[PDB]
Write a protein that binds this DNA or RNA. Structure first.
Ligand SMILES: Nc1ncnc2c1ncn2[C@@H]1O[C@H](COP(=O)(O)OP(=O)(O)O)[C@@H](O)[C@H]1O
Ligand SMILES: [Ca+2]
Ligand SMILES: [Zn+2]
Length: 613
DNA sequence: GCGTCGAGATCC
DNA sequence: GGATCTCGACGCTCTC
């Protein structure tokens, strides 16, 4: 499995390794990086599957530096292009972009530079619409191609009027290699991407999509106190760190933001109800940690944000699909540092999302109900490892269920925290009871749970009243939720006089199958320091961060593009002002110590006494 | 008009 | 600390 691509004896190895160490300041290759770098430098077409934060950028940026000529990178978002170019400029790697969001005089200047004997530009980032609308671009690529200075085509996020366009590039310039990258976890989509690009004999580099540093939690939601719960959890676990709070509605964003602001927390709301410039202002404040620590957002927020130091993502209400949850929680810890993914769950939010699906135009309504049901299952599954649940959902099996046990510092709540019964007789009695009391039904799920348990609060004291005497309230609630998810029972939403969605229970499509036929129902029962030096290291880190923020203002660059969180962390841990020591740190380079070194070394020299333990 | 949530009051 | 009942507010919808 790519054994030939594991060699460090190729004619290219020496210049490649020197660029790895001297330009990038790196020391060790991550999974499949060396293999993909070697394959690309040999002129092989590559297909790379890595999760977010895996290190996909190096796979084309290191070869781009080694190769003579220009590596053309096709990317869909202007913001992701701007951020990549900032990283490369910071490292003194000649890079630029053409997105339309460039002056006509400035774009013409990029074409002028590209047509020179030595184009100098190693990486050119383009938007997919430039492949079709820019004759000036294609004529420039034609010129580079005739001169053997078109090194590679990169499709940074491979994900209609995009794929036929990338195929146009291959037909126009067939001898230039192609590298395609994707972070999509969906195994059928990974196959569709690979077959659709139709690349000749591709080298395919894939790996586990398990984000080792993401700690997944699901907590019961107290709807009237969720904002105070988020607030307390933030001040206890991440008072000085950036985060996102995902909320179901625009009003809930404004409420969440207002509550946090009243406690002195720098929080801002982000939803489509805001103007485009107001949204842009919120996003920039949040990325730069400048007047915004917490973004309280609807699904309107996300696409095109690569902030590497998000320490928490809180879902104040569950999302509408597992894919959405995976993408939203996935915004956390892109730098590999421990980050938290916390979801506040209540079944009441499920029927709030069910009324959102009932407001749409259609089979597509049944699809969204199914996707939602898959998300409710993840919430209700308080037994299986949260990592294994998400991975199994995206066709990744064989994964170690002992991961959260082997690495307890990044454990999910299910691994930190079981029987079985043939309840078919009980469900047959529930089904015959809701048949007789079938807005389309007479009772809600809560009413049904009271009756079943034989509660004094029950609205009827006959039929199934007390039938569930052997179940606890928690198990009776779980039993009824299971029947709705299993389509044995169904819910009809009724809008009351206060615009509240009320779910009345009726028979589902599988009710006649449980009684008439024999659909056996199985239910499973459940029950629910410090050091003087370490403190100085912590103090030095805050100072080092402030340095990057002031340098960021003067260079017109995001602070994390000066030095990332891992580099900053390691720099603070060293407490050294000696370059010989600083150059062994990942991301520390001669070019960066020249640019930023004076400001960085002046902070480190103040901790001179604590350098040696 | 009425379902739902959560605080307050019971007994364990 | 639960478990269980009763009373009294308060109730509201996501993306190009
Ligand atoms: N071999 C490596 N050693 C150390 N850091 C690395 C290495 N490869 C990548 N990184 C860093 O890991 C982080 C995530 O990489 P990135 O290219 O942005 O990931 P992706 O595109 O897969 O989401 C970046 O900060 C990057 O500089
Ligand atoms: Ca990327
Ligand atoms: Zn686990």
């Amino acid at each position: 499995k790519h054994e030939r691509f594991q060699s460090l004896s190729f004619p290219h190895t020496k210049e490649m390794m020197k660029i790895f160490h001297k330009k990038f300041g790196l020391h060790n290759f991550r999974t499949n990086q060396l293999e993909a770098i070697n394959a690309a430098l040999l002129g092989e077409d590559c297909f790379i599957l890595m999760p977010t934060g895996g290190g996909k950028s190096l796979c084309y940026q290191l070869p781009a530096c080694v190769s003579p000529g220009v590596t053309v990178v096709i990317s869909p978002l202007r913001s992701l292009i701007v951020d990549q170019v900032q990283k490369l400029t910071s490292l003194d790697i000649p890079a630029t972009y053409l997105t339309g969001d460039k002056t006509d005089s400035e774009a013409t200047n990029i074409y002028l530079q590209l047509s020179k004997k030595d184009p100098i530009i190693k990486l050119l980032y383009v938007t997919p619409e430039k492949i079709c609308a820019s004759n000036r671009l294609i004529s420039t690529l034609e010129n580079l191609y005739e001169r053997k200075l078109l090194a590679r085509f990169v499709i940074d996020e491979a994900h209609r009027q995009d794929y036929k366009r990338m195929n146009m590039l291959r037909q126009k310039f067939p001898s230039v290699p192609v590298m395609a990258l994707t972070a999509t976890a969906n195994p059928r989509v990974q196959k569709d991407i690979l077959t659709q690009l139709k690349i000749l004999r591709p080298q395919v580099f894939s790996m586990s999509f398990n984000r080792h540093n993401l700690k997944y939690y699901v907590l019961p939601k107290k709807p009237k106190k969720v904002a105070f719960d988020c607030l307390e959890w933030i001040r206890k676990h991440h008072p000085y760190d950036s985060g996102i709070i995902y909320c179901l509605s625009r009003r809930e964003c404004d409420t969440m933001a207002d509550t946090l602001q009243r406690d002195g927390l720098a929080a801002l709301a982000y939803h489509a109800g805001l103007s485009d410039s107001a949204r842009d202002e919120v996003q920039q404040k949040w990325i730069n940690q400048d007047g915004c620590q917490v973004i309280c957002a609807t699904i309107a927020f996300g696409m095109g944000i690569d902030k590497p130091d998000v320490r928490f993502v809180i879902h104040a209400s569950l999302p509408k699909s597992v894919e959405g949850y995976y993408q939203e929680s996935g915004r956390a810890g892109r730098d590999g540092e421990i980050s938290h993914c916390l979801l506040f769950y209540t079944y009441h939010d499920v029927t709030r999302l069910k009324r959102l699906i009932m407001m749409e135009k259609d089979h597509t309504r049944e699809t969204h109900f199914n996707n939602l049901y898959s998300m409710v299952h993840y919430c209700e599954n308080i037994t299986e490892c949260r990592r294994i649940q998400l991975l199994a959902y995206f066709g990744e099996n064989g994964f170690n269920p002992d991961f959260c046990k082997k690495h307890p510092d990044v454990s999910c709540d299910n691994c930190c925290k079981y029987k079985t019964r043939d309840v078919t007789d009980d469900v047959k009695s529930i089904v015959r009871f809701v048949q007789e009391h079938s807005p389309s039904g007479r009772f809600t799920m809560n009413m049904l749970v009271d009756i079943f348990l034989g509660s004094k609060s029950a609205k009827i004291q006959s039929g199934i009243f007390g039938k569930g005497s052997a179940y606890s309230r928690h198990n009776a609630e779980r039993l009824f939720k299971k029947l709705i998810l299993d389509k044995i029972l169904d819910e009809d939403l009724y809008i009351n006089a206060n615009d509240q969605a009320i779910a009345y229970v009726m028979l589902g499509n599988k009710a006649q199958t449980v009684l008439n036929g024999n659909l056996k129902v199985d239910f499973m029962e459940t029950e629910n320091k410090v050091s003087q030096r370490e403190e100085m290291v912590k103090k030095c880190l805050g100072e080092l961060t402030e340095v990057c923020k002031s340098l960021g203002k003067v260079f017109g660059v995001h602070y994390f593009n000066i030095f990332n969180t891992v580099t900053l962390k390691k720099l603070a841990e060293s407490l050294s002002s000696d370059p010989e020591v600083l150059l062994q740190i990942d991301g520390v380079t001669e070019d960066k110590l020249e640019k930023y070194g004076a400001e960085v070394i002046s902070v480190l020299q103040k901790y001179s006494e604590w350098t040696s333990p």
